[PDB]
Structure formats: structure tokens, C-alpha cells
């Protein structure tokens, strides 16, 4: 098996997660005949990969057959023990002969990549290197086994045509997880779901680009022995646009972390929410005028797509929910996070300063705490109950007064934790300042935009993504166009209720698998049969309905949402890959 | 008190010089010049010239000693800069990561001691904690040099201190034997960074250099000597004049009286450099004895 | 060099400390030609010794020359890096032929050991083994060097006669640190210092025993090329009783631990006194009616000799000082420790229970402390100064009341921390209950008898001896008969003022080395020209005078006492051993 892809060592939301979750089961069920191919980027990928430059059995012949011939191929383990013997390929090591590879592409399939975008050039170069490695392996192994080559996305789709030109006896499977042409039309301010058969692919390809990419994608789909897509909705645009109906639907699964107790995810949520509460206390210093027990943490994560990931409708719903909470005289407050990576330069002074003063207050309270504890210990040793007024003197009251005065703040807490280099052109900040949300005292919702992926080694918010998601209360992902949707998937795996859409692969998958959804925390939101304003109103209604329920109802809802983890497990969802491999073997050679 | 305050200053230095802790901290001496922001009156130009010269001698002498010189002179700022707060944040993030590995190691060691078997030291730490230590080490990697000013001043092109610092080529580099930290604000016990009031910080330093040209009496050296810290006064100062005829043979009690009346500016700078180097050469025992004599 | 002795691996107050302190300088000045010989006891001595059974250079010939011949010889390092290549000898391994060794002793010097005491039989067996090892080494080394053999005490004195019988060409030095006959006459309720020339050695030897021991000691003194003693007072009884005037006086030194700062011993004293204060709070639970800042810690340590170490006079002085402190209306209190090992079975329930309730109160105060700190942190985060009455609720007051009630105690704290198996015959407890000292509320002095050596791994008092001594305030050692005195020596080395005697080697040594003593914390107490009652009165006066001075005076006195460490340093006191070695070399062979 060869699961060649571009995201194996570099962290990107797509491809990387599905491969990392699949590797364990796909290796334990099959064995050491599982091989993974990907690129090399000088970004720290070697930190997570245990490279094996020295010769190693289980395809030891290529190391002394081709490595010392002007190429660069490594063998790694990934630090994940699913037996993922990964074949890492360097991109910049072999780039001096791009002209001959372009000529080879011209001879074979009249395709290639223009010099405008280096991403696709690197993808094609990696495809050439992968094809050379696979051919060398077949030559060295005397063609005794019939290996199956599987391809993900267009970043590794040139392998299909390269192998078909050379007629290598392998079973070809191609699985596209996102028709990028659909992605770039859905961002073109044009309706995409009302009609699909009225699109002219060649006319649209090129004004927004995606002409060579579309051509190579369709060539791979046609020439691949087995074609596959993520959701049933994915197959719909695949057969209507690429004119190649997928052989079988292959829903995306996850490696659920089973605990010895059913309620351990609740404890993880409690701890992570405590950490988020510490961050909130840091950010809203001098403005802690709202109860923190009535605070709910909403969030929308993923790549920074405004109209595709559904951030405009979420912000409109947040403004409306703020208006209803203000006019209803409610003590509930909602802190909404926005984890969408936009380029910054560093943090702003306000956020780091807020964390600093929060922990300075923590230190001052600690000091008074040890002094009080020592005096109380003396009193208990003597045998007299404290009268509570003889312990604290004038100096510690003086320093508490000084600390309180130092934390006084007149400006409002910032909406962005980082210092972005383009604030006049950022959609999120623009609409935030348009809808009049500035974390004010009167505001019932507080927006925090964290334009960066979460990491466990960050100066502020020392939580990785999974822990932070476990800490939140509701994940709102009203995405207009996205094939499957991972973020709601692990939200429901970790027990957090989520707001999906009927235009999403996750929402569609959970639509017909459960009778009466939204009773299990899956607030499916209709975006196909409703206008934008109606969808915003429905999102506001869903948010308010989540707000009105008490703590017991929230706990019960989280339990019900967690109970659905078995649907997205790779044990249940891995059978489709096995079926695809069986069809590929039957088509190529029994 | 000096030991505790120097420990706090060491924590601040570790925060500021994160990813650049290539110098021994036991060979680090903390000089400072405090008071109101007068350049030619409080003697900040001559101090910076002497700092540059002492850096040159320490570099050409192959010395392991390093000197961190503080400049507490209030100039109007707007807030801190991102680099300094970020440095404190990553320092205490490393502290938290080391703490986490520390509790895990302590629990495993407690289990081993309860069983009755001496640790073999390789069965305790697994792959995950090594992974997070590697990630923490990578996160603290830094390519830019530590800043010379902890705050964000609104006029850097017209500040005398920063101008002469960038003129004398001092940027807290790895090769630099002296590191300059300009803190344009009075110290306070309730500050987000450096949570020390002025007296505690002065107790933590090693030598207070106040080569003031014109000032009537001089308080800063007075409480420096009251708290035991050796000081460098001048014969144009009221404190220096007062201590001149009250003690036979000064500079044997930590009062490095510096002549600025009968000497030119260059000669005064050379004498200040000689005094700084002489303070640098003496060992820990000599420093302790000198602090006792000054107290 | 061969510093053969019985206390090299087993912990005994004498011999062990002097050898362990000397080894560093005597090895750094000379080198790897330094060899140490001692016995083997199955008591954990191998834990502190890195045995080298495998062959090792620097006398590698004996390992393959004699070890595989029915004997048992090891090579060790001691874990002390003074280069102490120690030659460890097993005692029980070679004991099957004691009859032939007894016959050899009869042939050589008409000496030996009767079967009443196994200590001296083991000593003689170890002496035979040492002589065999030394002879084998000379045979293997072709007698190229002229090694010097030095002997300590009568536990290794048979080596002198054994080597003299065989006429081995070595330079013999013998250093007796205690004339044991003097020790056992001074405990016989007979005056010993008024006259020395009127004693009949043979008549006294045997009724109290020490006949064979005395004979072999005097034979070693006569036959040794160089004879040496600890103090000038030691030489006095040596020449008047053994009839062999020592060649030179060899005062006992110590390896002083120099710190980078002069005042570090003050900080060590502060920390150790804090630990002793924790122990006192544990022991006196429910009876902490006295200020702990006015508490002074006196102690008398060493082996359990009542009339020789001066414990009766110390207890009489403690009772008198208690009477004066009571009638003077003083707030000062004195806790007097008695570290004298007597056999026990385990601790008593009261002391362990007291430590337990002390740390239970510590835990309860801690719990209230975290609750208070969290509430205070919330208040400071809000921005409001605490009003100090809204934080503590009824439950934590309830548990503080319950804890206070649980620590109520009606019986007085015990005087002995352990459970001794003979309380009706213990001199210390007998005189304590006679002088009416029971740690009462009215008592101004509190006596704690700890019948065991201090250790760092004890369930209570987790302090080794040096740390505890650093923590105390005054070491009272009014010893009647003891040759030199180590305990006051390291008391003054570590800065603690001490009360020595003019009958002591340390007191005599410090008498003529400093003008006007007792101005440096050395309270020399006259016991030769004064009666017992007068000595007790002088001790009471010294204790009261120490009590009256304030904290500043105590600190200054500790500084002055610490300044005298250079007198007892081995650098200054090691020249006498060098002189003795030079005389031995001159007498044996130039
Ligand atoms: O701060 C973040 C936010 C998102 N993700 C990852 O990004 C993926 C989102 O994938 P999705 O299919 O939702 O959309 P994509 O970002 O791939 O377009 C999830 O698997 C997350 O694990 C992350 O690692 N850190
Ligand atoms: O960070 C600082 C620096 C200086 N000072 C005070 O400023 C005074 C300096 O007075 P001096 O006579 O040296 O000169 P002045 O500043 O009055 O001109 C000293 O007493 C210090 O206590 C302070 O409080 N904090
Ligand atoms: O709790 C104790 C008490 C005493 N000692 C040691 O016992 C020795 C006392 O020797 P000294 O010459 O005072 O009298 P000895 O006990 O040898 O007769 C000192 O060196 C101490 O180090 C000890 O290790 N722990
Ligand atoms: O954050 P909430 O919705 O109020 O949930 C409250 C918390 O949920 C879970 O983490 C646990 O059951 C906690 O015990 C509970 O306090
Ligand atoms: O900072 P230094 O000059 O090296 O002084 C070293 C320190 O001085 C004092 O604070 C104390 O004596 C400390 O015990 C000592 O370690
Ligand atoms: O126990 P005392 O005799 O009262 O001595 C008091 C203590 O002595 C030394 O340990 C130190 O100087 C301490 O700073 C001091 O508090
Ligand atoms: O369909 C699988 C997932 O990965 C894809 O590459 C897309 O980035 C994401 O939107 C999709 O949900
Ligand atoms: O002379 C007394 C002190 O206070 C004065 O006001 C000056 O500011 C200062 O330089 C002087 O040393
Ligand atoms: O004289 C040296 C020291 O060790 C001796 O063996 C005695 O036990 C002790 O009292 C003496 O002070």
C-alpha cells in the first residue's frame, strides 16, 4: 500500500489529520507492507519524524539502489506507533532538472504547472520523485507482489498520469477530499448549490486559474482504476463536474481516544475550561464585571475562509444573540473565540500585559495567602480560634490596594490577541467593528480573535487545539461550502455539541444516521433551502436555545453528543477503504 | 536581602535573554545608574563610554565575566514592547514545562522509593515528555537580539541613551561581554515585569555607578552605601565630598570617588573604566568583604 | 603509609571521625601511597564503601598473591574523594584457626584475649590479618620502599608485637587517643586527677579487667619506634602510667567546610533551628504556651557515659537555671537535648503522635489557606479590597474548631522520644525525674532525651548530627574525663559556642592558644580545682549568663566562636603527624 500525499510531515488541517488517524488501523489490520510518501519542508518536520538514513529491511533495496544517485529519500516512523513506515522525499534537493520533467509531462499528458505558483510545481516535482521511487522498488522487488497505490488530492495527482504513461502494473486508487474548483467558485459570490449541471468548467477554469489543476485532476479521475470521494454530497459534484462517478463513498473517520470511564471527557472539559477561564481573567483584567459561572465559550476554528467556513453568519448571530441577551436582562455571558490563522507580526502589548497583570494579582494574593496561612498556623498551634482581624496588618492591605490600583483599566479589552499587519482589510475585524462588538461592559458577548493555530508551547493559551476544544461549550461551524468537516467531527468525538450544516459532509452524514437530530447536540442548520438572513435567524435561535438551558441540561447534552463517537470511528468507517482496495485489486489483477 | 533580590534580577535576566543564555549567570555583575533622566548631569554618557571600554577589555582579555548594566531613568513611553513581555512569558512557560516534567519525575521516583528499588533513571521519562521538552526548546529559539529598552518609547530617534547605545555598538549580542537594559520608568512592586521596588532592586545589584557631573548632594549613592552596595561617586557631588574628608583613604570602603574637577572628560572616562575593571577582577569573597565594609 | 584502625567502615564516635577528616589532607599531600586497613561488619559498611574485588593497580600483586588463599581482602574508596584506597578485611571469614593464632601469641609475647569479650578477639584476629597482608605486600614488592605503619587504639595494637616478632623492616608509629584504663578508673567513683603517680596499674587491672589490654597497650608503646598521644594532658597520663613518654603531641583536627561567604554558617543555623522548631512544635502539641522566639536549644552529645561526659552536672545546672528563670519572671525558655545512645525498642506513641498532630494542624491550616487564597484571588480579580468577613464560611471554622479540640492534651510531653527497655535503671531518666523536670507549663526548661544518634532518614528529626548541632544555640560538654573532645571541636568549627572543661584536651588546647577565653564563646569550666557542687554552680552561672544576652550578642558570640576554626584545621594541626612520620623514618632507616 502506498498512501502518497502532500500533508504527511507538514501540519495542514486537511489530509494530515485523516492520514494520521487512519494509519493506526490501516497498519494494524494489514501489517508492515504499508508505505507512506510525502514531501520534505525545512519547517521542523524532522522533529516529529524519526528519519532512518541507514539501510533498513522491509524494502531495503531502494536505499542502496537509488538513494546514492542524485536523489534524497528517508524512512521514518512519525512518533506514532501505528507502524507508519513513511518514505519522506526532499523537494529542494532534486530541482535542477525541472525542464526535462516539463518536457516529459508535455510528451505524456500535455500537462504541467506554470511558474506563477510554486506550490503546484513542488507538488509535481514530488510526484515525479514518488513515481521514480515506486518504479525503482518494483524493479528491485522483481514484481513479486502487486502493490496498491493510493493518491490524495491534486497535490499528489500527477502520479496517476505518470504511472499510466509507464504502464506500471499497480492498482490505482484516487480519493479527492475537496474539488478545489467548487471551493473557488463558492468564494466567487455566485450560487453553487441551486444548480450544478449549468456550470461550464473550461470557461470558469483560468479566470480564477485552476485550469491545469482541473485538467490533471480529471485526467487522474479518468485514468485511476478506482475513484473515491469523502461524502455522498462530494460524489454529487464529482460526477456532475469531473464526469467520473466515484466507485464508492468513503466517509472520513477519527481515532477516538477511549477512556476507562465514560465521564472522563467531562473532567477533561472541566480542566480545559478552567484554563480558558484563566486566559479570560487575564484578557479581561479590570473588567471582570460579569459572572464567570454564567460564561459559555463558543468557537469557530479551521482555515481562514470567511464565506466558506461560515464566519460572517456566526458574527451576525453573535450580534443578534448579544442584543437578545441585553434586552432580556440576562446574567449569562458568551465568550466567542475565532481560531482562524491570519499572518501577524507578534502579539499586541495589551494581551500579554493582561496575562502579566492577572498573574501578578495571582502572586500578590499568593503572598497574602502564605502570610495568612502562617498566622493561622500559629493560632491553631496555640489553640485559639482566629478572630480574623489581628492577622492582616497595614502593609499587606497597602500592597493589595496598590495591586488593585495597578490593574485599573480604562480602555476596553482587545478583540485580537495578536498584532495583525493588515487590520483595515481583515474581514473578521471589519465585521466585528461594523456590528459594534468591542468587549464592552454592556456587551453580553465578548469576541476573541486568535489569528493562529493553538499550541501547547505558546506564551499565552498554553493549550493545544484538542484541549481547548474540550474546554469550550459549543462549536459553531455554519460552513457554506466544505466537503466533509473535521472540526465538528472531533467536537462530537470529544463530547462538545456542534452546529453543522446540511451543506456539509458531516451534517449530511449525521442527518440520515440518526432519527431526529439536534436531540444529540448536532444542531443541523439548513443553508440550502433558506436565504442568508433566514440562516442567520436560525443560527441565532440555536444559540439562544443553547444559552437558555441550565448546567444539568448542558451536561446531559454533552453526554448525548459524546455517545455518537462510534459513528465516526475508523473501525466502523474503515470498511469503505477496504472495499476500495478490493475493487482496485479486482480491476487490476486478481 | 541582596541574595534574594539578585535571584529576582536573575529571573528577570533569564526572561529577557531567552534563547541567548550563552553566558554563565554566576559570573554576571549587575551595575545600574538611577535617578531622574538627566544625561550630562547624572553622568550617563561617561558611564556608557566606560561600559563600552570595559566590554572591549573583557572581550580582548578572554574573560568569562559578564556585566548587565541597568539604566533606570524615567522617559515617557506608551507601554512595554512585545519582545520583553514575550521574553518573560516564554521564561515562565519553560518554568511551567520543567515543573510538569518535575512532578511526573517526582511521582515516578516516589513510586520507585515506595517499592524499594533505586531508580535506573531511564525507565521514568517516556516519549511524550521528551516530545514536549523538544517542542518547548524549539519554541524558545530566537534569532533577533534581546532589546535594550524594556518599554516602547515614543521618541527613539531623539533619546540620548538609545542614541549613544547604538553609537557605541552595544546590542546585547552573544559576543558582547556587557548587556545594557534601559528601563525608562521608576521601579514598582506591582509591575507586570520586575515586581521589585527601587530599594529591593538596588539591594540586588552589585555596584551603583553614579558619575554625576553636577548634583548638590546625591541620594542614590547614599542609600546604596546604607544598604551595603558599593558605589562610584564623584568629587563634584555632595555625597562624595562628604565621604571624602570623613574617611581616611576612600575606595577601600567601596566608595570609588571619581575625580571630575581636575580631570578632562576622556580622563574621567578612563578612570571610570579602570574602576569598573578593578571591580570586575575581584572574586566573590572580595565582593562580600567590600559590601561589608561599605555597609 | 598504613593507618590501620578498627573504625574505618563502622560508625563510632572516635577514630572514625579523625581518620575521615585526616584522609583528605594526608592523601593530597602524599599521594596514592596511602593505605587504610580496617575490619568488615555486616551492618551496612559496604553501602559507604565502593569495594574493588577485581584486580586493581597500586598494589595489584596481593589480590592475585594472597586473596585466593583462604582470606578475604577488599579495596575501597569510601565515597570520600581524598584518595583513601582502603584495605577492608573480613573478620568472620577467617576465624576457623583461632587456636593457632593464640599459640602464636603465646610464643611471641605471652598475650592474647580471653573468650569473655568477643570485641577484643575480633580486634586480635583483624590484627593477624593486617600483619599477613602487610607481610605479603612486602614480599611481593621486593622491599623496594620503606613503608610506614601507623596504629590507632588497642583495637589495632597487636600489630606492633606481631611485626616486632617477625622483624619486618617498617617504621612503627602508635597513637593512642584514649588510655582506656584511665576511662574505667574515672568511672569507678575514685578521684583520678588529684594524683597519678600513686596508682598501682597491675592491681587495678583485672578487677575491672583491662589486664591483657593494658599489657598489650604497654608492649605496643614500648616496642613502637614512635609513640604519640592526642593532647598534652594525654601525654601526662601516658608517661605516668604506660611509662613511655610520647615523642610528640598530635592534636586532633577537623576538615572545616569553608563557604564563599563568612555568614553562611549563620544561615545554616537559621534553617536548622527552623527544623528544630518544627520538631519542638510537634513534641509540645497542646502545650505551646511559651514564646518560641525566646527559646534556646542546648544539647550534650556523644557516647552514653554519665559521669565521664558530664551529664549529671549538666542536669543539675539545668534544674538550677530553671529555678532562677522561674523566680526571675523570665520569658526565656530553654530546650535541652540529650543525644546519648541507649538501647531502645522503638519510639513511644506520644512522640510520633505529636509529630502527626503537628503536621495534621499544618494540613488543616494549609486547606484553609488555599480556600482563603482562592477567595482573595477572586476578590483581587474583581477589583474590590477584601472585607475579610465574607470569605471564611461556617464549615472551615467548624474544621478549625475540630482540629483545635483534637489537639487538646492533658498529659505532659514526654522526656524521652524513644521507648527504652530499662527506664528504672537509666541514669538520665532517673535524675530527670529526681530533679522534678517533666516539661510542665511552669517549667522554664524542657528536657528532650533522644537515645539514638541523629540521622537524616529518621521518621522524626530528619537531620543528621552536623545540621542539628548547627541549629542549636549552645553545646554544653562538661566532661570530667575524656582525652580530647570532638563534639565541642565541631561545635566551634560550625560557629556554636561551647562549654568545655580544663580536664579536656579541647579545653586545654584552647586555654593557652587564646588570651582571655570565654570571650570567644569557649566557656572553659574548671573541674580540677573545684568540687562537684562548685562546678555545678559555675555551670549554672555560665548558662544564666548565656541566657541573659540578647539576639545581637548571641550572633556576635557565634561569629567570634566561628573565627576560631583555623586553630583546629588539619592544615595547622597536620604538621605534627608529618613530624611523627619524619621521626619514624629517621629511627627506622634514613
Ligand atoms: O487551531 C486549530 C484549528 C484547526 N485545526 C485542525 O484543522 C482541521 C480542520 O479541518 P476541516 O476539515 O474542518 O477544514 P480544513 O481546515 O481542512 O479546510 C481540524 O482537523 C483541526 O484538527 C488545528 O489543528 N488547530
Ligand atoms: O527607580 C527609582 C530611581 C530613583 N528613585 C529615587 O530617586 C532619588 C534620587 O535622588 P537624587 O538626589 O540621587 O537625585 P534627584 O533624582 O533627586 O535629582 C532616590 O532617593 C531614589 O529613592 C526611586 O524612587 N526609584
Ligand atoms: O548524634 C551524634 C552524636 C555524636 N556523634 C559523633 O560522636 C563524636 C563524639 O566524639 P568525642 O570525642 O566527643 O567522644 P567519644 O564519643 O568519641 O567518646 C563526634 O565526632 C560526633 O561526630 C554523632 O555522629 N552523632
Ligand atoms: O461548563 P458547564 O457547562 O457549566 O459544565 C460544568 C462542568 O461540566 C463537566 O466538566 C463536569 O461535569 C464538571 O463537574 C462540571 O462542573
Ligand atoms: O553576587 P555575589 O557578589 O557573587 O555575592 C554572592 C552572595 O552575596 C550575598 O548575597 C550572600 O553572602 C550570598 O550567600 C552570596 O552567595
Ligand atoms: O537563634 P538566635 O540566637 O536568636 O539567632 C537568630 C538568627 O541567627 C542566625 O541564624 C541568622 O543571623 C538569623 O538571621 C537570625 O535570625
Ligand atoms: O473533506 C475532507 C476535508 O479535507 C479537505 O482537504 C478540506 O480541506 C476539508 O474542508 C474537508 O472537510
Ligand atoms: O541635594 C538634595 C537632593 O535633592 C535635590 O532636590 C536634587 O534633586 C538632588 O540632586 C539633590 O542631591
Ligand atoms: O581523643 C580522641 C577522641 O577519641 C577517643 O577514642 C575517645 O573516644 C574520645 O573521648 C577522644 O576525645
Swiss-Prot record, chains A, C:
Pathways per UniProt: Glycan biosynthesis; glycogen biosynthesis
Record protein name field: Glycogen [starch] synthase, muscle
Modulation of this protein's activity: Allosteric activation by glucose-6-phosphate. Phosphorylation reduces enzyme activity by constraining a tense conformation of the tetramer through inter-subunit interaction. Phosphorylation reduces the activity towards UDP-glucose. When in the non-phosphorylated state, glycogen synthase does not require glucose-6-phosphate as an allosteric activator; when phosphorylated it does.
Residues where Phosphoserine is found: 384
Residues given in the record as UDP binding sites: 11, 303, 487
Pathology linked to this chain's protein: Muscle glycogen storage disease 0: Metabolic disorder characterized by fasting hypoglycemia presenting in infancy or early childhood. The role of muscle glycogen is to provide critical energy during bursts of activity and sustained muscle work.
Family the UniProt entry places it in: Belongs to the glycosyltransferase 3 family.
Keywords in alphabetical order: Allosteric enzyme, Diabetes mellitus, Disease variant, Glycogen biosynthesis, Glycosyltransferase, Phosphoprotein, Transferase
Tissue distribution: Expressed in skeletal muscle and most other cell types where glycogen is present.
Lineage: Eukaryota, Metazoa, Chordata, Craniata, Vertebrata
Reaction(s) the record says it catalyses: [(1->4)-alpha-D-glucosyl](n) + UDP-alpha-D-glucose = [(1->4)-alpha-D-glucosyl](n+1) + UDP + H(+)
Subunit structure: Part of the GYS1-GYG1 complex, a heterooctamer composed of a tetramer of GYS1 and 2 dimers of GYG1, where each GYS1 protomer binds to one GYG1 subunit (via GYG1 C-terminus); the GYS1 tetramer may dissociate from GYG1 dimers to continue glycogen polymerization on its own.
Organism: Homo sapiens
GO biological process terms held by the UniProt record: glycogen biosynthetic process; heart development
Amino-acid positions noted as binding alpha-D-glucose 6-phosphate in the UniProt annotation, renumbered to this chain: 263-264, 266, 269, 273, 473, 554, 558
Range within the parent protein: 29 to 618 of 737
GO CC annotation terms, alphabetical: cytoplasm; cytosol; inclusion body; membrane
EC number: 2.4.1.11
One GO molecular-function entry: glycogen synthase activity, transferring glucose-1-phosphate
Function: Glycogen synthase participates in the glycogen biosynthetic process along with glycogenin and glycogen branching enzyme. Extends the primer composed of a few glucose units formed by glycogenin by adding new glucose units to it. In this context, glycogen synthase transfers the glycosyl residue from UDP-Glc to the non-reducing end of alpha-1,4-glucan.
Binding annotation for UDP-alpha-D-glucose: 177, 183, 303, 482, 484-485
Signal sequence annotation: none
Enzyme class at the top of the EC tree: transferase
UniProtKB/Swiss-Prot annotation, chain B:
Binding site for UDP-alpha-D-glucose: 36, 215, 217-218
Modification Phosphoserine, positions: 117
Positions of UDP binding: 36, 220
Tissue spec. comment: Expressed in skeletal muscle and most other cell types where glycogen is present.
Binding site for alpha-D-glucose 6-phosphate: 2, 6, 206, 287, 291
Function noted in UniProt: Glycogen synthase participates in the glycogen biosynthetic process along with glycogenin and glycogen branching enzyme. Extends the primer composed of a few glucose units formed by glycogenin by adding new glucose units to it. In this context, glycogen synthase transfers the glycosyl residue from UDP-Glc to the non-reducing end of alpha-1,4-glucan.
Disease: Muscle glycogen storage disease 0: Metabolic disorder characterized by fasting hypoglycemia presenting in infancy or early childhood. The role of muscle glycogen is to provide critical energy during bursts of activity and sustained muscle work.
Record text on subunit structure and interactions: Part of the GYS1-GYG1 complex, a heterooctamer composed of a tetramer of GYS1 and 2 dimers of GYG1, where each GYS1 protomer binds to one GYG1 subunit (via GYG1 C-terminus); the GYS1 tetramer may dissociate from GYG1 dimers to continue glycogen polymerization on its own.
Family as reported in the entry's similarity comment: Belongs to the glycosyltransferase 3 family.
Protein name (record): Glycogen [starch] synthase, muscle
Shown segment, full-protein numbering: 296 to 590 of 737
